[PDB]
Design a protein around this ligand. Structure first.
Ligand code: L3W
Ligand code: FMN
Ligand code: SF4
Ligand code: FES
Lengths: 155, 419
């Protein structure tokens, strides 16, 4: 496994940003996931080499942080808050609307690999409950008609 | 400059301080900030000695807005008793359920936070500062990175700031989905490029922090008060609210209210006033059943006349107000809290690791009416036994809110025992 030049230069930028190389580990993993749609297990050894860290340190970090996914490749991660406020205000209505539009449940990926529903804890936008994200974009769920129009923007 | 989409959280103020600009749901860039006299508190601070700044922050009565209410000036005094180099850290992890107060400052008035970080770093003699922002705040991360560059271009950051001889760089680190990285020692571990595992305290970070060096960790909201203390002076700041717990406070209000959002209010405001006078009362005018102070405490409808301050009988915490009404099932709400602790324990301590898991597993059996008599006794035992040997605040409070619902709503819990 070798990182493509375009990705390798971005990883090098994160590594040169902090006073110590190892501090860039989360920024680098965020970059790897953005590029591939997941964390390829084969990418961990060349990243560990770039950060000057043992492979098991990098493996332990990927396993600890919930945003990182080593199993499913997805173009768009639909992060659905399942915490207390969103639950009270309508998470189940948002999850039913996602099932009606995409045919998938939390933890599943669409057959085309376009969307994955990721249940998450409080997203810190509780006054706008029920909350969801589509990769970096965040929204309040209003209705299935409103949600359908939002999802059509992700090609 | 394009940022990811963010929902427009409603913000209202009676003080026009932390929300002077942030009451408008948009990024206020450096030119607009300068037009309001922004960075003038930093210029005044660079003409004061670091010791005078610590003194005004101490005399202002500013307390930690991250939830524990520790006196800010006293924390800074502890850091400067130890030899340098020292570090300053802005805690922007904000992952407590119901809490969305800090993102309002970050996304709308980033220069207020930046000015506060510069003055605070100068006060403690730190030449490197870090903002640790949760991974689920990507717009906040990009906004901060751009605002720091704007500050650098105008000469407010870098070497020899405004000819003062003071050097500072602000680095922005991103989290990656762990609520425990909000705990200041786990945050430091994460900044050092490791798993977010809390450290045994004492030593507190002011003695041994980032790379084992004296480190001050403060919450976003605490820091955003620092430009006001310098600008107004500590006496003027101390006239806001009660003179013992002075200053503006941000209150993220959500759940069953007519006007959910962030309210900037003095700390003499009562919980009843937050809900009914400011947040417009309840949805459908239903009776208040409970208020969840994040995942920390449960207040009943008999406890609404309490002040929103850091006094022994005050609301305290982060000022997080989650409103539940008469229709909301307390056991189902307790299950959501149990699920949160189950998902967030770092697993270092055995009673916390196994207890957070078992509390949620057994409460789910109870909620579905599948619990045996042993499961009920086991749930009661586990709830009381998550804290032993715990080395951080998560294990100490994972059973707190749930135990409070058992004590305050016995009739509702009893209905599930018979189910
Ligand atoms: N925006 C958000 O989402 C947000 O803020 C969420 C927060 C959720 N938390 C959940 O537990 C809140 O945290 C709260 C507990 O947080 P903690 O750091 O364990 O509290 P401590 O009392 O240990 O320390 C508070 C601060 O003062 C320092 N300090 C204490 N004694 C010191 C001493 N002798 N010498 C020097 N420093 C000293 C300590 O080093 C820390 O700096 C909980 O009360 C929830 O309120
Ligand atoms: C599990 C846990 C999570 C926490 N999360 C946060 C957080 O997101 N933001 C925060 O500023 N403090 C959080 N804290 C409190 C910090 O450890 C610390 O008290 C605070 O950042 C110090 O800043 P302050 O004195 O300005 O409040 C958390 C504490 C614990 C026990
Ligand atoms: S008390 Fe829980 S969250 Fe805190 S260090 Fe121990 S296992 Fe981790
Ligand atoms: S509970 Fe869903 S955003 Fe906070």
């Amino acid at each position: 496994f070798e990182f493509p030049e375009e990705l390798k230069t971005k990883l090098q930028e994160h590594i040169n940003y902090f006073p110590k190389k190892r501090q860039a580990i989360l920024l680098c993993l965020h970059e790897i996931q953005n590029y591939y749609g997941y964390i390829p297990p084969e990418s961990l050894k060349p990243l560990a080499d770039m950060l000057e860290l043992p492979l098991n340190h990098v493996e332990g970090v990927v396993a600890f942080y919930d945003m990182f996914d080593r199993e499913d490749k997805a173009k768009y991660r639909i992060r659905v808050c399942v915490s207390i406020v969103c639950h009270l205000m309508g998470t189940n209505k948002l999850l039913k609307a996602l099932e009606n539009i995409l045919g998938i449940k939390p933890g599943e990926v669409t057959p085309d690999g376009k969307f994955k529903i990721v249940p998450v804890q409080c997203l810190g936008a509780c006054s706008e409950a029920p909350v969801f994200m589509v990769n970096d974009d965040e929204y309040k769920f209003e209705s299935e008609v409103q949600l359908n129009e939002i999802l059509s923007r992700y090609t | 400059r394009s940022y990811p989409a963010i929902p427009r959280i409603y913000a209202e103020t009676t003080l026009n301080m932390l929300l002077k600009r942030a009451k408008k749901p948009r990024v206020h860039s450096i030119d607009e900030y300068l037009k309001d006299g922004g960075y003038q508190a930093l210029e005044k601070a660079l003409n004061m000695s670091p010791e005078e700044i610590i003194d005004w922050v101490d005399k202002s009565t500013l307390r930690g807005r991250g939830g524990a209410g520790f006196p800010t000036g006293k924390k800074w005094k502890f850091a400067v008793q130890n030899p340098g180099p020292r570090y300053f850290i802005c805690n922007a992890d904000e992952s407590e359920p119901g809490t969305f107060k800090d993102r309002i400052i970050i996304e709308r008035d980033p220069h207020l936070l930046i000015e506060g970080i510069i003055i605070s770093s100068y006060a403690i003699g730190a030449n490197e500062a870090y903002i640790y922002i949760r991974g689920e705040y990507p717009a906040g991360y990009y906004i901060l990175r751009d605002a720091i560059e704007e500050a650098k271009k105008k000469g407010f950051l870098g070497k020899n700031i405004l000819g003062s001889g003071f050097d500072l760089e602000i680095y922005v680190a991103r989290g990656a989905g762990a609520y425990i990285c909000g705990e200041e020692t786990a945050l430091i571990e994460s900044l050092e490029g490791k798993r977010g595992h809390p450290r045994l305290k004492p030593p507190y970070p002011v003695q041994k922090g980032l790379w084992g060096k004296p480190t001050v960790v403060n919450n976003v909201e605490t820091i955003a008060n620092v430009p006001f203390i310098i600008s107004m002076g500590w006496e003027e700041y101390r006239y806001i609210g009660p003179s013992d717990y002075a200053g503006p406070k941000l209150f993220p209000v959500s759940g069953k209210v007519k006007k959910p959002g962030v309210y900037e209010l003095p700390m003499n405001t009562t919980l009843r006033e937050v809900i009914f006078k400011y947040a417009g009362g309840t949805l459908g005018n239903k009776k208040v059943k409970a208020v969840f102070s994040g995942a920390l405490d449960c207040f009943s409808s008999e406890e609404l006349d309490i002040p929103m301050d850091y006094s022994p009988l005050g609301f305290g915490g982060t000022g997080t107000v989650i409103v539940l009404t008469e229709e909301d099932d307390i056991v189902e709400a307790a299950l959501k809290i149990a699920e949160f602790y189950e998902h967030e324990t770092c697993g270092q301590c055995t009673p916390c690791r196994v207890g957070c898991y078992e509390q949620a597993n057994l409460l789910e059996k109870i909620y579905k009416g599948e619990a045996t008599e042993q499961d009920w006794e086991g749930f009661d035992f586990v709830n009381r036994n998550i804290q032993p040997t715990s080395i951080c605040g998560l294990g100490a409070v994972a059973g707190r809110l749930i135990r409070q619902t058992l004590e305050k709503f016995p009739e509702e819990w009893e209905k599930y025992r018979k189910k």
